[PDB]
Amino acid sequence: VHLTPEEKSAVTALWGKVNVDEVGGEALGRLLVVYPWTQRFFESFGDLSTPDAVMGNPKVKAHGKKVLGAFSDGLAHLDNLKGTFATLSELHCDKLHVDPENFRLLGNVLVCVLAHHFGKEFTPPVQAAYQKVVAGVANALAHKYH
Amino acid sequence: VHLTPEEKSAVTALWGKVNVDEVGGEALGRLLVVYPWTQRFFESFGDLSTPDAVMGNPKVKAHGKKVLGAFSDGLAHLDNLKGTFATLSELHCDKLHVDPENFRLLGNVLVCVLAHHFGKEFTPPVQAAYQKVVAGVANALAHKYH
Amino acid sequence: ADESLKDAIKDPALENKEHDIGPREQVNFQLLDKNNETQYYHFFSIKDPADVYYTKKKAEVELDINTASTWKKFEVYENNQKLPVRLVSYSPVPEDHAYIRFPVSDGTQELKIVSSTQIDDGEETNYDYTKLVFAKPIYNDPSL
Amino acid sequence: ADESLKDAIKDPALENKEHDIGPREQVNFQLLDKNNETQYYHFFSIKDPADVYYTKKKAEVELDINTASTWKKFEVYENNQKLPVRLVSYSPVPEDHAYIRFPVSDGTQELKIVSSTQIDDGEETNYDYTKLVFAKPIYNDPSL
Amino acid sequence: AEGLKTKDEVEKACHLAQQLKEVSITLGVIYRTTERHSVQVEAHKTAIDKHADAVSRAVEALTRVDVALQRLKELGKANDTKAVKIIENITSARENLALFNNETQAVLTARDHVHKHRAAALQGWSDAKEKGDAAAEDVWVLLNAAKKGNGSADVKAAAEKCSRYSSSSTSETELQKAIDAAANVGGLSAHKSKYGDVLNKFKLSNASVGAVRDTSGRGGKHMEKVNNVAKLLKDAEVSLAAAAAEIEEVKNAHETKAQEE
Amino acid sequence: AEGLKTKDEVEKACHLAQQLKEVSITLGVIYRTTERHSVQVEAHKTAIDKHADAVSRAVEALTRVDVALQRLKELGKANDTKAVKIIENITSARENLALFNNETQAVLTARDHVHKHRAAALQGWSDAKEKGDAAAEDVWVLLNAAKKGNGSADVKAAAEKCSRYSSSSTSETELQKAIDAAANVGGLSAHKSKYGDVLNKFKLSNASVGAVRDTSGRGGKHMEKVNNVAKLLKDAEVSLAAAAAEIEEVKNAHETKAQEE
Amino acid sequence: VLSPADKTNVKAAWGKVGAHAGEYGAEALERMFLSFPTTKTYFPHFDLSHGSAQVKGHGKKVADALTNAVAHVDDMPNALSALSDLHAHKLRVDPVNFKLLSHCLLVTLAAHLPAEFTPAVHASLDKFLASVSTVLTSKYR
Amino acid sequence: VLSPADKTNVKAAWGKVGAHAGEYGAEALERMFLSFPTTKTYFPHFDLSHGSAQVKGHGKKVADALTNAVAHVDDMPNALSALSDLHAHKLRVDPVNFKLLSHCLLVTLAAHLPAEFTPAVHASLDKFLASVSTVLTSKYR
Amino acid sequence: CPKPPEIAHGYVEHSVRYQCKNYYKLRTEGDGVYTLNNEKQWINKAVGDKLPECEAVCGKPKNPANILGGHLDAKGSFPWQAKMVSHHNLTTGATLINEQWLLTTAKNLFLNHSENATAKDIAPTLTLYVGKKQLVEIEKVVLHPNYSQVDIGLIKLKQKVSVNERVMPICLPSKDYAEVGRVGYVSGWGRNANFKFTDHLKYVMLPVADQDQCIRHYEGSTVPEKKTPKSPVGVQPILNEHTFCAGMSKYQEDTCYGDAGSAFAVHDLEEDTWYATGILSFDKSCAVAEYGVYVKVTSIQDWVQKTIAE
Amino acid sequence: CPKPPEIAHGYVEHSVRYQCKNYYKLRTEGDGVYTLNNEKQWINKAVGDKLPECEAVCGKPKNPANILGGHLDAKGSFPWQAKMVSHHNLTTGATLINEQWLLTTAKNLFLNHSENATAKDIAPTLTLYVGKKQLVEIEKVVLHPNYSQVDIGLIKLKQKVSVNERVMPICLPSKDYAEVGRVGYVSGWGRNANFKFTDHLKYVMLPVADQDQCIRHYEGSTVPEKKTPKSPVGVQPILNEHTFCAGMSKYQEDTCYGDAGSAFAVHDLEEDTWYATGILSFDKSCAVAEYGVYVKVTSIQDWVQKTIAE
Ligand SMILES: *[C@@H]1O[C@H](CO)[C@@H](O)[C@H](O)[C@H]1NC(C)=O
């Protein structure tokens, strides 16, 4: 979707401060904990039962990174969201059959984790900008479903 | 067939002298004896084996009479021979399946018996006239075969 | 033998037996009735000429007769006395010929035949007198 | 009893037992921390107003506490000495309310609560000092 | 006795005459239907003769071992080795000979029976010709009387339309059904005890025709059994020939004995 | 180690990467294919609990007749009439109770087995994700090297046409057939001992999936046998109730005795 | 097929015919030409009229053929052999024609010989002319 | 479903919110109108701008509703009953909208309270707004 | 198909069962049914693509029966009987052995022809008849290599003839009924006791006669050194091990000129079939000669089969 | 018939065998074959002139298996699932019980309507969907006489719907699997954890729950005098002997607004058929309330059969 220059600027500048070895994995592990049915896809990881196991399990943050990266690619090219995730869309929709609702569910837990690290500095306009982003991602990721 | 008036006259005048209680039956039993396969139709009579039995057997002359009569009817109406025997033709051809050759075989044994009783008085012209007769009869009797 | 000829041929020993051995003359004959016209039944029944076989004592005439099975009485007389007739061969039923022999005295020409023919059990037909006339006299020739 | 409250509610004799028999007063209170601002965890966990039951000797206050299963240490002090706290009824797990009674001396208003909350085996959260302030003093009335 | 009725009962009588006449015809065709069995049983005789001569040599041989088992009724009835082992090789020979004089006799009896029945067939035919021809003739004097019989005038028409012979053959069925239509209406006939005869001779006659097909059939069965077992004897003729002549030394049990006393 | 070859061996590998990547996917779908059995065996536990309480009254009763057949091990073991004829009416009661503690235990063992296998299923999955993802990644550094690798230039084209995921799932079959085409030509890999792992963990994993369908199936068989015989006990509860209390006078064979000594 | 019985009858009857054997032969032929005019096409140049010398003489031949036949009746085909070939091959006479004359010969004998024409003889006389009429024809082709 | 564990966490966390409960309520709403502009169609006459007194006060109401809920969390539907009917029937709020504000309330609490927002709490805080956001909606029709 | 009606949501699978019309028979292995394909092919699961063919029955006349003498042919009980006339109006017999062929005698064939003449010469000369008037044309003619010993021809018809109640072939026997004790049926177009060629097919039953009695009748013998021409009519029959003799009738009916080539047909009562046991060679015997004589068909077997192949 | 070829002297006897197309079945006694007549009639030797009809199968989805939570419907494993929207864009469930009819709840039916409203009022209001987008039109609507106790409707479709892999009825059970220890499958069009009406059909496995535990959960009781409204969401489910309760998921998935009328579908492994054991009444429970509750289908049996008749 369209983004005002000061939206994209506030977005990218914030994304700069985002720890890329941690945040993504934390967003993922919370999703596992908050909406336990997604665990179904990941139980290959190890113990997913307790929140500490999930948050601790080394394959989880290992995984989150790749996911977080996948989100970094979005912020990189926001005009071609469909295309950037076109293949990723195939992995989840055509091979996996993830229900597209769990993309947004995850994009939101991400925005939660964003707000967790950045405190008052994650401002209502900045969320509102990121909301556009985790949507556009969730949709593009869901595009091969039609 | 056509017959000259003096043929018919020599014929009828001779037929007058013919014994009607004997001749026909004698013609029949000679046929049984001379051509033994006709016995097949008559064995209901009694013993037909020896010539004396045949000639003697009371059902034979009894039968011959009716046959002889049947021939008398011919001399009566010689122009409609077909019609006179039309029904008789049905008895032998349609019901019985007598082979038409035995009509003439019989008509001839009759002419033999005729010549037997009447000696020199059965003259070559008179036979030649009677030959026309036992033929016409044999044919008319055979007409329902076609 | 000559009382019943059709009973005579019933002897099995006589069938297709050889009667032809030895010296013989062939003499034509006539067969006539009592008015000296041909006896047509005998004429027809007996082979002409007649083999006459030579012996030590008297010549024996041999007669060839067909329908032997319907022949009954066959008697042959020389000077009104009975000759001893006997059957030598018989030829079975498509043939039905009987072969008989009897002695005749040297000089004989005429012969008397008293015969009869009967078919099975039926009417016996008697033939009263039949004159057999050899076209030449019969003479024995023991020299052969 | 007041050494571990979540072990205390495990006694089956106490479930949905009647604590409401007899004469009672209803006294609102405040729950404050050591800076005299509301102790929000305790504020939230204990029913306001408080049933105070009359007896022969001293009035017994009854406290209504939810999430009893996650409560551990609950000690109540009057003039810095230990009151003999005991559990009277418990309401099982969709409810999870524990009901406790202790005597208070006529004239008491302030009360000291040393408490702690621990979920299962996890981190124990100690609540050092909690001041309970009745909106009016407590006086027994044996006359009822 | 008086004949006539409505234009119905003229026909009922017309159909009777026609069936009544046709019994003498039909029963004829049927007798001839059985000439086959007559001539067939005759040829069985011919062949049975031929077989008797065919096996003559083999029976004459097996007779010799019977007549040499007689003078053997002195020292030979007991375990003569080369003798008592002969009856072991004559095992099947005497089997077949037993079957032969059994089965041949059967086709002979079958034979005799087929003629008798064919005679009873014949007899029955001749009778029912009389009875039938008679009867048909009677019901034709009423039929001819109805020609110019003062008429119902549709009764008059109903005679001249009538013809002497039926168009078809006659069952026992058709016949009774002709007597049937005749009895009830127009007891005008009331001859029914005589129609009883022509049917009963009919029935009797057919009875015998069927008897010969049945009885000649089991004849041909037996004849086939005859031809077979006769071959077993003719081919074992050589066997049996030396079998009786192997009782040769059994005759030495006589010759070497009967002299010394 | 050096990767490349003709435009064939690029896609003989491309297919490997694709199968090698797709093992971590397919094996996933398969584990989830078995959630059904997991939750099913769980509800079996729920119901087995419920039954134990359902028949509680009837077992407690049948226990009473066991414990009253003990003090009866003095005067009662011998033909007490109204006692020894009780075991005659408890005939089927103890039959079912025997079947109950038999069949219930079976669905319990079936239960335990289905988890273990589903665990071995699970373990196998996680391994073959590593091994496979690892391996697929390696044969992608040759695949990416072939992108601008000095080229056959039809080899260049034969990379960029290639895509990360297979279009379809993977058998054990397809996998070996991917290793097959990979081994011979282009021993360029010569990693085949590691592909051996991803297949062996694959095989091992599927092995256990199949194990649960098989082992959960015989569970549901046993459970059905559980539900039935449990009804026989619950409805005979009233029967058994008065059956143990009919040993009442058998206790008088104690009371009327134990006092006098 | 001429059994002994037949053979006897034919001889005994043909004897009673005697010297008239010639004259019957002609009377017989005459009947045939009068009764069955088609038989005349075998005798073109003959005067066929009543008592024609040509007819009358020819009858003496036919008569004699017959007498010969009864003379050796026990072998007819040898006796009639030269006649087998004459009618069969040279003259080509249609075998139907013999049965006419056979019958005319039966009519003729009937007229002149009432007493011997008993059914039994009628049989064997017919067989005899059969047997003969066959032998002439069987070499037809 | 709010176990004892959840219940404890929600109280302990909402306590650490304290007097700011009001001020968060407004910050939360603000995010919602900024993030999801469609929710503004329920508040036509409100001044929706930054720190609007109308927004700020309304947040104090919503805050208090929530505090009430944790005050008696062991019976929410009685406590929230008058609010069941208000949103369900009178106001007809589309149940999707509660899940927005649910999340904005989660974003908001995250920002202001880093130390308590451990995953365990994130769970029960979400369940709690689930449990509440349900009770308002379940009388929808 | 007078097309079947449709049913809702359903389809039709077509079958046909082949059956051969009256007087014919199914030939194939080949249970006869054929199902339609999605390939729209007609397929029998045994023989596949191959159809059956309909082959004429033999020895089953539609109306069975049940020459000097009798038995007028009322019904047409002898459908295998053919009347062949030579160039000069000489009537002669032949019998129909299958849809294309008829047996006859070498003799009948050679009428009005020189010993010189070959098959090619004779075939156009003949006129042939089946059934009623039915004129069957005639392609070739073939003679047995032993014609002077085995008196036998073969006629090939230009096309096959349609079989029905009046026209239909006779069965060649596996078994041989030439033995005495058997009885046979001879049809014929030959002459009768007026020595007229007959106006109606007739037939007669005759026993089969002892071979030695027959020999001794015609020649004198058995033994060949005593052989002389004893034959009652002028001409001698052919007599060897390939011939048999049939006696005279019960009523002295017999078989005369024209009756050669007519079949001595023995009816087998167990299997109810009509076999041709023999073909008539010597039709000369008539009144006067005690045995008509036939050539056993079993003895010309391997030759007729062999010829049929061309 | 792509007409069979002719054979010489032979004829054809036609048969057809009726077969029902994919996802259908033969109904008749009635072995299915029909032979053509000389009367040119199509005749089965059992039922004669009567054709068969093709009847839809139930409980056999072409691609089987193996709401807040998961299981995206990849294949269309739930062909009997219908999505019905009320007049005001409220999405609600219904399941297809045969070619013309679908079960649903009295409640779903009554949305945007007064208690006053009768069936005739409600039927035109609704929009109904099967399969993908497939719009089936809607003839009448009929309510259970006990609607306030047994929460159940019946929908009649204006015509029958064509059955295939994505659209096809579910089997009504002879047996009753409402017992605990059974497991079930619920499909649904209802809301998810964003409280959005779902974009894709989903499904969840749920155990069936002990009836007393469930009762004590929603009311306080068992015994009716101790009954109080204990329900975790605002509203009370209908609970009687015609209902049963299904627990929550393994992963805490549950069934929310819109999920009523969706069938609690139990797969029978022995006969490999899908039965509708229950229909969802109370779809309100979601996160917060431990049991969604279904009305046993076995208990509405004799009524649904009865209604179908009209
Ligand atoms: C008797 O003959 C008739 C025909 O006339 C026939 O219907 C019947 O079957 C024959 N025999 C028996 C035993 O019925």
Ligand SMILES: *[C@@H]1O[C@H](CO)[C@@H](O)[C@H](O)[C@H]1NC(C)=O
């Ligand atoms: C393992 O799964 C594959 C499909 O990936 C299948 O072909 C194979 O049959 C399975 N194993 C067994 C033992 O069936």
Ligand SMILES: *[C@@H]1O[C@H](CO)[C@@H](O)[C@H](O)[C@H]1NC(C)=O
């Ligand atoms: C149905 O929805 C419309 C939407 O505006 C509303 O106005 C109407 O009152 C509703 N009717 C009922 C009976 O709920």
